[PDB]
Amino acid sequence: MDIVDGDQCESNPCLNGGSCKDDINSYECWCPFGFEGKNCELL
């Protein structure tokens, strides 16, 4: 039996060609050129 934090990136929360890196109980988005915001939502 194990405890797993889970992959919070499996829902693809990073938008607009952004890249998702899983973290602990969270994720970070690496945004492409021309996009910003926590989910790369902002032009």
Ligand SMILES: *[C@@H]1O[C@H](CO)[C@@H](O)[C@H](O[C@H]2OC[C@@H](O)[C@H](O[C@H]3OC[C@@H](O)[C@H](O)[C@H]3O)[C@H]2O)[C@H]1O
């Ligand atoms: C999968 O996709 C949905 C929308 O399509 C996201 O909202 C889900 O992320 C949510 O659920 C898991 C939480 O870990 C996540 O919030 C944490 O990670 C991002 C940080 O910006 C935030 O401060 C932190 O609480 C939440 O956004 C995603 O799993």
Ligand SMILES: [Ca+2]
């Ligand atoms: Ca995780």
Ligand SMILES: [Ca+2]
């Ligand atoms: Ca889009």
